[PDB]
Design a protein around this ligand. Structure first.
Ligand SMILES: [Cl-]
Lengths: 75, 204
C-alpha cells in the first residue's frame, strides 16, 4: 500500500509499505528516499509518536495514511 | 575550542534549562507552519527555536565564538530576554551569568561564555551521544531563536552583528507570524534540503 510522510518544510514523501512493516523499516525507506539517518527521525500519527518495534498494522495505519516526520537535528 | 552540538530534543533542553536555573518554560515540536498544525500548539508561545542548514537597546544579545555552542547561545538568548516574564532561580548558573555580564557588550559577554566552565560542563551533560568524529567536527546546522520583545519579532543569532527585527505582532499571532518569516526567509531559500527542525517554547 501507499502511505504519505509530511515534513516540516511541507514536502510530502510517498512510500510503498505493507501493514507488516515496522516503524524501523519505514524509517529505512525514508533514508533510501531522502538520505536522513533513522536515528534522527521521529514519526507521528494521530498525535502519537510511533515506536520503532511496532508495525504499521499495530497502529492501525491504513492505506493513504499521512504521517508527520520530525527531525532530531544537532546544531 | 571544540564542543559537541546540542540536539533539538525537548526533554534534554528542558532538563538542561532546569539545571541552568530555568524550570518555568518547556519545549514542544512544531510539525509544520500551516495554521492547521500551529493550532495544536498550546498558548502563549514565548519563542520559537529553529534549526536550519548553514536601536535594539531593549534586547539582550551575545556574540558566538565557539563554533558548536550555538544551541547554548540560543538558550541564553531565550532566557536573557524572558528574564522579566520568567525569572531565573536565584544564585543559579544563569542568574550569576546574567548579573555578571549585564553591563558588558555582546562581544565581551561572548568571551565570558568561553570562560564559563559551569556552562560548558552542563552543555555536555545534555548534548546527546555522538558516534564518530564527524558528529563533532562536521556541523552543517545552525540553531537560532525567535522571541517577541516590545511587540516585535526579534531573531537572535550570535554570529550576526546585531539582533534582527522582523515585524510587529500582538496577542497570540506570534507563532503564526514567526512561521511566515521562517517559511519565507529560510525554508523558501532552500530547495531540496529537508534538514530543518523547530520547537515552540511554552510555559511549563
Ligand atoms: Cl525523543
Amino acid at each position: 500500500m501507499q502511505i504519505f510522510v509530511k515534513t516540516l518544510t511541507g514536502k510530502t514523501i510517498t512510500l510503498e509499505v505493507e501493514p507488516s512493516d515496522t516503524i524501523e523499516n519505514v524509517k529505512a525507506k525514508i533514508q533510501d528516499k531522502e538520505g536522513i539517518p533513522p536515528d534522527q527521525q521521529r514519526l507521528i500519527f494521530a498525535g502519537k509518536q510511533l515506536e520503532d518495534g511496532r508495525t504499521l498494522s499495530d497502529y492501525n495505519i491504513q492505506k493513504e495514511s499521512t504521517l508527520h516526520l520530525v527531525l532530531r537535528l544537532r546544531g | 575550542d571544540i564542543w559537541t552540538p546540542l540536539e533539538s530534543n525537548p526533554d534534554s533542553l528542558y532538563l538542561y534549562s532546569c539545571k541552568l536555573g530555568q524550570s518555568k518554560l518547556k519545549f514542544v515540536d512544531i510539525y509544520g507552519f500551516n495554521n492547521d498544525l500551529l493550532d495544536m500548539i498550546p498558548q502563549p508561545v514565548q519563542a520559537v527555536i529553529f534549526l536550519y542548514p548553514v536601536n535594539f537597546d531593549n534586547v539582550w544579545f551575545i556574540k558566538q565564538y565557539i563554533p558548536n555552542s550555538c544551541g547554548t547561545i540560543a538558550l541564553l538568548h531565550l532566557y536573557g530576554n524572558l528574564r522579566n516574564k520568567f525569572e531565573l532561580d536565584k544564585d543559579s548558573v544563569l542568574d550569576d551569568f546574567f548579573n555578571k555580564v549585564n553591563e558588558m557588550s555582546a562581544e565581551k559577554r561572548g568571551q565570558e561564555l568561553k570562560n564559563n566552565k559551569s556552562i560548558e560542563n552542563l552543555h555536555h551533560e545534555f548534548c546527546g551521544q555522538v558516534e564518530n568524529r564527524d558528529d563533532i567536527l562536521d556541523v552543517d546546522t545552525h540553531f537560532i531563536v525567535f522571541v517577541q520583545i516590545e511587540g516585535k519579532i526579534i531573531e537572535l543569532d550570535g554570529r550576526k552583528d546585531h539582533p534582527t527585527v522582523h515585524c510587529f505582532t500582538n496577542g497570540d499571532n506570534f507563532l503564526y507570524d514567526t512561521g511566515k518569516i521562517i517559511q519565507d526567509k529560510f525554508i523558501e531559500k532552500c530547495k531540496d534540503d529537508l534538514r530543518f527542525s523547530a520547537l515552540a517554547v511554552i510555559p511549563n
